[PDB]
CSV table of C-alpha atoms and ligand atoms in Angstrom, one decimal:
chain,number,residue,atom,x,y,z
K,1,UNK,CA,122.8,74.1,85.7
K,2,UNK,CA,124.1,77.7,86.4
K,3,UNK,CA,124.4,81.2,84.8
K,4,UNK,CA,128.0,81.0,85.9
K,5,UNK,CA,130.0,84.1,86.6
K,6,UNK,CA,129.3,87.5,84.9
K,7,UNK,CA,131.2,87.9,81.6
K,8,UNK,CA,129.1,89.5,78.9
K,9,UNK,CA,128.0,86.0,78.3
K,10,UNK,CA,124.2,86.3,78.2
K,11,UNK,CA,121.8,87.8,75.6
K,12,UNK,CA,120.2,91.2,76.2
K,13,UNK,CA,116.6,90.5,77.2
K,14,UNK,CA,115.7,93.4,75.0
K,15,UNK,CA,117.8,96.3,73.6
K,16,UNK,CA,117.4,99.9,74.4
K,17,UNK,CA,118.1,102.7,76.9
K,18,UNK,CA,118.8,101.8,80.5
K,19,UNK,CA,115.9,104.0,81.9
K,20,UNK,CA,116.6,102.9,85.6
K,21,UNK,CA,119.7,101.0,86.8
K,22,UNK,CA,120.4,98.3,89.3
K,23,UNK,CA,120.9,100.2,92.6
K,24,UNK,CA,119.4,103.4,91.4
K,25,UNK,CA,117.9,105.3,94.4
K,26,UNK,CA,114.2,105.2,94.2
K,27,UNK,CA,113.2,106.9,97.5
K,28,UNK,CA,114.3,106.7,101.0
K,29,UNK,CA,115.8,103.4,101.6
K,30,UNK,CA,114.2,101.9,98.5
K,31,UNK,CA,116.6,101.4,95.6
K,32,UNK,CA,116.1,99.4,92.3
K,33,UNK,CA,117.2,95.6,92.3
K,34,UNK,CA,116.7,95.4,88.6
K,35,UNK,CA,117.1,97.4,85.4
K,36,UNK,CA,114.3,99.1,83.6
K,37,UNK,CA,115.1,99.0,79.8
K,38,UNK,CA,113.2,101.0,77.2
K,39,UNK,CA,111.4,99.1,74.4
K,40,UNK,CA,108.4,99.5,72.1
K,41,UNK,CA,105.0,98.3,73.1
K,42,UNK,CA,105.2,94.6,72.2
K,43,UNK,CA,108.9,94.2,71.6
K,44,UNK,CA,110.0,90.6,71.9
K,45,UNK,CA,111.7,89.9,75.3
K,46,UNK,CA,114.4,87.2,74.8
K,47,UNK,CA,115.6,84.8,77.5
K,48,UNK,CA,119.1,85.7,78.6
K,49,UNK,CA,120.4,82.2,78.9
K,50,UNK,CA,119.4,78.5,78.8
K,51,UNK,CA,116.9,77.5,81.4
K,52,UNK,CA,113.3,76.6,82.4
K,53,UNK,CA,110.3,78.9,82.8
K,54,UNK,CA,109.3,78.6,86.5
K,55,UNK,CA,106.7,81.3,86.6
K,56,UNK,CA,104.5,83.6,84.5
K,57,UNK,CA,102.1,85.5,86.6
K,58,UNK,CA,100.7,89.0,87.0
K,59,UNK,CA,102.2,91.0,89.9
K,60,UNK,CA,100.8,94.2,91.2
K,61,UNK,CA,103.3,97.0,90.1
K,62,UNK,CA,105.4,94.7,87.9
K,63,UNK,CA,102.7,93.8,85.5
K,64,UNK,CA,103.0,90.2,84.0
K,65,UNK,CA,106.3,88.7,85.1
K,66,UNK,CA,108.0,85.7,83.7
K,67,UNK,CA,110.8,84.0,85.6
K,68,UNK,CA,113.4,81.6,84.3
K,69,UNK,CA,115.6,79.2,86.2
K,70,UNK,CA,119.1,78.5,85.0
K,71,UNK,CA,120.2,76.3,87.9
K,72,UNK,CA,121.9,76.9,91.3
K,73,UNK,CA,119.1,79.3,92.2
K,74,UNK,CA,120.3,81.6,89.4
K,75,UNK,CA,117.2,83.0,87.7
K,76,UNK,CA,116.2,85.8,85.5
K,77,UNK,CA,113.0,87.9,85.8
K,78,UNK,CA,111.1,89.9,83.2
K,79,UNK,CA,108.3,92.3,84.1
K,80,UNK,CA,106.1,95.1,82.7
K,81,UNK,CA,105.2,92.5,79.9
K,82,UNK,CA,101.7,92.5,78.3
K,83,UNK,CA,101.9,88.8,77.4
K,84,UNK,CA,104.1,85.8,77.7
K,85,UNK,CA,105.2,83.5,74.9
K,86,UNK,CA,105.7,80.5,77.1
K,87,UNK,CA,104.1,78.5,80.0
K,88,UNK,CA,105.4,77.5,83.3
K,89,UNK,CA,107.5,74.2,82.8
K,90,UNK,CA,108.6,75.1,79.3
K,91,UNK,CA,112.4,74.8,78.5
K,92,UNK,CA,113.8,77.9,76.8
K,93,UNK,CA,117.2,78.3,75.3
K,94,UNK,CA,119.1,81.6,75.3
K,95,UNK,CA,117.8,84.0,72.7
K,96,UNK,CA,114.3,82.3,72.7
K,97,UNK,CA,111.6,85.0,73.0
K,98,UNK,CA,109.6,84.5,76.2
K,99,UNK,CA,107.6,87.6,76.5
K,100,UNK,CA,106.3,90.8,74.9
K,101,UNK,CA,107.0,94.3,76.4
K,102,UNK,CA,104.1,96.5,77.4
K,103,UNK,CA,103.7,99.2,80.0
K,104,UNK,CA,102.2,96.6,82.3
K,105,UNK,CA,104.3,98.0,85.2
K,106,UNK,CA,105.9,100.8,83.2
K,107,UNK,CA,102.9,102.9,83.9
K,108,UNK,CA,104.5,105.9,82.1
K,109,UNK,CA,106.5,104.5,79.2
K,110,UNK,CA,106.8,101.0,77.4
K,111,UNK,CA,109.6,99.1,79.2
K,112,UNK,CA,111.1,95.9,80.6
K,113,UNK,CA,111.8,95.2,84.3
K,114,UNK,CA,114.7,92.9,84.1
K,115,UNK,CA,116.3,91.4,87.3
K,116,UNK,CA,118.8,88.7,87.9
K,117,UNK,CA,118.8,86.7,91.2
K,118,UNK,CA,121.7,84.6,92.2
K,119,UNK,CA,121.1,82.3,95.3
K,120,UNK,CA,117.6,83.8,94.8
K,121,UNK,CA,119.3,87.1,95.7
K,122,UNK,CA,119.0,90.1,93.5
K,123,UNK,CA,122.2,91.2,91.8
K,124,UNK,CA,123.3,93.8,89.2
K,125,UNK,CA,122.6,92.0,85.8
K,126,UNK,CA,124.5,94.2,83.5
K,127,UNK,CA,127.8,92.1,83.7
K,128,UNK,CA,126.0,89.1,82.3
K,129,UNK,CA,124.5,91.0,79.4
K,130,UNK,CA,127.0,90.5,76.5
K,131,UNK,CA,125.9,90.5,72.9
Z,1,UNK,CA,84.9,98.4,92.7
Z,2,UNK,CA,86.1,100.1,95.9
Z,3,UNK,CA,89.5,100.5,97.4
Z,4,UNK,CA,89.7,99.0,100.8
Z,5,UNK,CA,91.4,101.0,103.6
Z,6,UNK,CA,92.1,99.3,106.9
Z,7,UNK,CA,92.1,101.9,109.6
Z,8,UNK,CA,94.0,100.5,112.7
Z,9,UNK,CA,93.4,102.5,115.9
Z,10,UNK,CA,96.6,102.0,117.7
Z,11,UNK,CA,96.7,100.5,121.2
Z,12,UNK,CA,93.5,99.4,122.9
Z,13,UNK,CA,91.8,98.1,126.1
Z,14,UNK,CA,94.4,96.9,128.5
Z,15,UNK,CA,97.2,98.9,126.7
Z,16,UNK,CA,96.3,102.7,126.7
Z,17,UNK,CA,99.4,103.6,124.7
Z,18,UNK,CA,101.0,106.8,125.9
Z,19,UNK,CA,98.9,109.0,128.3
Z,20,UNK,CA,99.2,112.7,128.3
Z,21,UNK,CA,100.0,114.9,131.3
Z,22,UNK,CA,96.3,115.8,131.1
Z,23,UNK,CA,95.5,112.2,131.3
Z,24,UNK,CA,94.1,111.7,127.8
Z,25,UNK,CA,95.0,108.2,126.5
Z,26,UNK,CA,96.6,107.3,123.1
Z,27,UNK,CA,94.0,104.5,122.5
Z,28,UNK,CA,91.0,106.8,123.0
Z,29,UNK,CA,92.4,109.4,120.5
Z,30,UNK,CA,93.5,106.9,117.9
Z,31,UNK,CA,90.0,105.1,117.7
Z,32,UNK,CA,88.2,108.5,117.7
Z,33,UNK,CA,90.2,109.5,114.7
Z,34,UNK,CA,89.9,106.2,112.9
Z,35,UNK,CA,86.1,106.4,113.2
Z,36,UNK,CA,86.1,109.9,111.6
Z,37,UNK,CA,88.4,108.5,109.0
Z,38,UNK,CA,86.2,105.5,108.3
Z,39,UNK,CA,83.3,108.0,107.9
Z,40,UNK,CA,85.2,110.1,105.4
Z,41,UNK,CA,86.3,107.1,103.5
Z,42,UNK,CA,82.9,105.3,103.3
Z,43,UNK,CA,81.6,108.7,102.3
Z,44,UNK,CA,83.8,108.5,99.2
Z,45,UNK,CA,82.6,106.0,96.5
Z,46,UNK,CA,86.2,105.3,95.5
Z,47,UNK,CA,86.9,103.9,99.0
Z,48,UNK,CA,85.6,101.6,101.7
Z,49,UNK,CA,87.0,102.3,105.2
Z,50,UNK,CA,87.1,99.4,107.6
Z,51,UNK,CA,88.5,99.0,111.2
Z,52,UNK,CA,91.1,96.7,112.6
Z,53,UNK,CA,89.8,97.7,116.1
Z,54,UNK,CA,86.2,98.7,116.6
Z,55,UNK,CA,86.2,99.4,120.2
Z,56,UNK,CA,88.1,99.6,123.5
Z,57,UNK,CA,89.7,96.2,123.7
Z,58,UNK,CA,93.3,94.8,123.4
Z,59,UNK,CA,94.2,93.3,120.0
Z,60,UNK,CA,97.5,91.9,119.1
Z,61,UNK,CA,99.6,93.0,116.1
Z,62,UNK,CA,98.8,89.7,114.4
Z,63,UNK,CA,95.1,90.2,115.0
Z,64,UNK,CA,95.0,93.7,113.4
Z,65,UNK,CA,96.6,92.0,110.4
Z,66,UNK,CA,94.2,89.1,110.3
Z,67,UNK,CA,91.3,91.4,110.5
Z,68,UNK,CA,92.6,93.6,107.6
Z,69,UNK,CA,93.3,90.4,105.6
Z,70,UNK,CA,89.9,88.9,106.5
Z,71,UNK,CA,88.4,92.3,105.2
Z,72,UNK,CA,90.4,92.0,102.0
Z,73,UNK,CA,92.2,95.3,102.7
Z,74,UNK,CA,94.1,96.8,99.9
Z,75,UNK,CA,96.0,99.3,102.1
Z,76,UNK,CA,96.5,99.8,105.8
Z,77,UNK,CA,96.7,103.0,107.9
Z,78,UNK,CA,97.7,102.7,111.6
Z,79,UNK,CA,97.0,105.8,113.7
Z,80,UNK,CA,99.0,106.7,116.8
Z,81,UNK,CA,100.1,109.4,119.0
Z,82,UNK,CA,103.9,110.0,119.5
Z,83,UNK,CA,105.3,110.8,123.0
Z,84,UNK,CA,108.8,111.8,124.0
Z,85,UNK,CA,110.8,112.6,127.1
Z,86,UNK,CA,111.3,116.1,125.6
Z,87,UNK,CA,107.9,117.5,126.5
Z,88,UNK,CA,108.3,120.4,123.9
Z,89,UNK,CA,108.9,117.9,121.1
Z,90,UNK,CA,105.8,118.1,118.8
Z,91,UNK,CA,104.5,117.3,115.4
Z,92,UNK,CA,103.0,114.7,113.1
Z,93,UNK,CA,105.2,111.9,111.7
Z,94,UNK,CA,104.6,109.2,109.1
Z,95,UNK,CA,106.2,105.8,109.1
Z,96,UNK,CA,106.4,103.2,106.3
Z,97,UNK,CA,106.3,99.6,107.4
Z,98,UNK,CA,107.3,96.1,106.5
Z,99,UNK,CA,107.3,92.4,107.2
Z,100,UNK,CA,111.3,76.3,94.6
Z,101,UNK,CA,112.2,78.5,97.7
Z,102,UNK,CA,114.4,80.8,95.5
Z,103,UNK,CA,111.0,81.7,93.6
Z,104,UNK,CA,109.1,81.5,96.8
Z,105,UNK,CA,111.2,84.4,98.1
Z,106,UNK,CA,111.6,86.3,94.9
Z,107,UNK,CA,107.9,86.9,94.6
Z,108,UNK,CA,107.6,88.2,98.3
Z,109,UNK,CA,110.8,90.2,97.5
Z,110,UNK,CA,109.0,91.9,94.7
Z,111,UNK,CA,105.8,92.5,96.6
Z,112,UNK,CA,107.8,94.0,99.5
Z,113,UNK,CA,109.3,96.3,96.8
Z,114,UNK,CA,105.9,97.5,95.6
Z,115,UNK,CA,104.3,97.7,99.0
Z,116,UNK,CA,107.3,99.8,100.3
Z,117,UNK,CA,106.9,102.2,97.3
Z,118,UNK,CA,103.1,102.7,97.4
Z,119,UNK,CA,103.6,103.1,101.2
Z,120,UNK,CA,106.2,105.9,100.7
Z,121,UNK,CA,104.2,107.7,98.1
Z,122,UNK,CA,101.1,107.6,100.3
Z,123,UNK,CA,103.2,108.8,103.3
Z,124,UNK,CA,104.5,111.8,101.3
Z,125,UNK,CA,100.9,112.6,100.2
Z,126,UNK,CA,99.8,112.4,103.9
Z,127,UNK,CA,102.5,114.5,105.3
Z,128,UNK,CA,101.6,116.9,102.6
Z,129,UNK,CA,98.2,117.4,104.2
Z,130,UNK,CA,99.3,117.0,107.8
Z,131,UNK,CA,101.7,119.9,107.5
Z,132,UNK,CA,98.6,122.0,106.4
Z,133,UNK,CA,97.0,121.4,109.9
Z,134,UNK,CA,100.0,121.1,112.2
Z,135,UNK,CA,103.8,120.9,112.0
Z,136,UNK,CA,105.7,117.7,111.2
Z,137,UNK,CA,108.2,116.2,113.6
Z,138,UNK,CA,109.6,114.5,110.4
Z,139,UNK,CA,108.9,115.9,107.1
Z,140,UNK,CA,110.1,112.8,105.2
Z,141,UNK,CA,108.6,109.4,105.7
Z,142,UNK,CA,110.5,107.2,108.1
Z,143,UNK,CA,111.1,103.6,107.1
Z,144,UNK,CA,110.6,101.1,109.9
Z,145,UNK,CA,109.3,97.5,110.8
Z,146,UNK,CA,107.1,96.4,113.8
Z,147,UNK,CA,103.5,96.4,112.7
Z,148,UNK,CA,102.1,94.6,109.7
Z,149,UNK,CA,104.0,91.6,111.1
Z,150,UNK,CA,104.3,90.0,107.7
Z,151,UNK,CA,102.1,91.9,105.1
Z,152,UNK,CA,104.6,92.1,102.1
Z,153,UNK,CA,101.3,92.0,100.1
Z,154,UNK,CA,99.4,94.8,101.8
Z,155,UNK,CA,101.1,98.3,101.9
Z,156,UNK,CA,100.9,100.1,105.2
Z,157,UNK,CA,101.7,103.4,106.9
Z,158,UNK,CA,101.9,104.5,110.5
Z,159,UNK,CA,100.6,108.0,111.3
Z,160,UNK,CA,101.9,109.6,114.4
Z,161,UNK,CA,99.2,112.3,114.7
Z,162,UNK,CA,101.2,114.4,117.1
Z,163,UNK,CA,102.9,114.2,120.6
Z,164,UNK,CA,100.4,113.4,123.3
Z,165,UNK,CA,103.4,114.1,125.6
Z,166,UNK,CA,103.1,117.8,124.7
Z,167,UNK,CA,100.6,119.5,127.0
Z,168,UNK,CA,99.5,121.6,123.9
Z,169,UNK,CA,99.2,118.9,121.3
Z,170,UNK,CA,97.6,116.7,123.9
Z,171,UNK,CA,94.7,119.1,124.0
Z,172,UNK,CA,94.4,119.2,120.2
Z,173,UNK,CA,94.5,115.4,120.0
Z,174,UNK,CA,91.7,115.4,122.5
Z,175,UNK,CA,89.8,117.8,120.3
Z,176,UNK,CA,86.9,116.4,118.2
Z,177,UNK,CA,87.7,119.3,115.7
Z,178,UNK,CA,91.4,118.4,115.5
Z,179,UNK,CA,90.8,114.6,115.3
Z,180,UNK,CA,88.5,115.5,112.5
Z,181,UNK,CA,91.2,117.6,110.8
Z,182,UNK,CA,93.6,114.7,111.2
Z,183,UNK,CA,91.1,112.3,109.7
Z,184,UNK,CA,90.5,114.8,106.9
Z,185,UNK,CA,94.2,115.0,106.3
Z,186,UNK,CA,94.9,111.3,106.4
Z,187,UNK,CA,92.0,110.9,104.0
Z,188,UNK,CA,93.0,113.6,101.5
Z,189,UNK,CA,96.4,111.9,101.6
Z,190,UNK,CA,95.0,108.6,100.4
Z,191,UNK,CA,92.5,110.2,97.9
Z,192,UNK,CA,95.3,112.2,96.3
Z,193,UNK,CA,97.3,109.0,95.8
Z,194,UNK,CA,94.6,106.5,94.7
Z,195,UNK,CA,93.1,109.3,92.6
Z,196,UNK,CA,96.3,109.4,90.6
Z,197,UNK,CA,97.1,105.6,90.8
Z,198,UNK,CA,93.7,103.8,90.9
Z,199,UNK,CA,93.5,100.1,91.4
Z,200,UNK,CA,93.9,99.0,87.7
N,301,ZN,ZN1,101.5,104.2,119.6
């Protein structure tokens, strides 16, 4: 019933380079609200903590996007995926693989769009990512 | 499977927009461009051009949305004329526009993000072409709200074709030729973008 406060507590959705970073200037006013992490076509995307899958749909730009509720209105988002490995309603425990990376928003290079929202509001995720 | 471009002739009927010192009226420019743009888009098999306003009447912000939605528009282009106090202020401009409850929001908040991006890229493209036929009063895309009301789903740009306040540009904006050139530009602008990022 909550991600709790950032403390390298949570699993890395996927491991690799941080291609784009929370806050990174995109263009004009627009600046990233997630991280783009590098990974191979079809690398297994793991759920950062314990929670329930509340969404798995295909969003223009962000490819197929899974979203996991952890409580409070703390949730994790995972986009650019080719395919999900769970269905809305499913319960997922941290570590559990929930998607497979693609370029499905990446466009240019296999990657994961990973975002955390706390009070449904997008924050820098990094401080949660521990081991 | 065609890309659907809503062309929104700014102002209309009751509201003339800005009127030049020579008495030419924003509304009668915007529509005259918008039709030339529809022609250039429907000419291109990649695109279908459709109008939010298709004659001289008033139509609310909302209504221009509801038309573009009811025409399943994939992207929207509003056409306007700028006008300043400073009568020698001239030049084209381009504007980029906007709009479990914690998921409810999150999805809109992503789509906002995409829209805003496509918008900006298209704006860039467009200015690109506009600066070939005129000068720009702003060479970067200016972010703003107002129109689009609440389309986080459909990206939109506003093209200030020039300053109808400026006795010179007024005459160009009343020029079939130059309206054509503006249409051509705004078109090439989209073409260049969607060419490179087709609807996949
Ligand atoms: Zn106007």
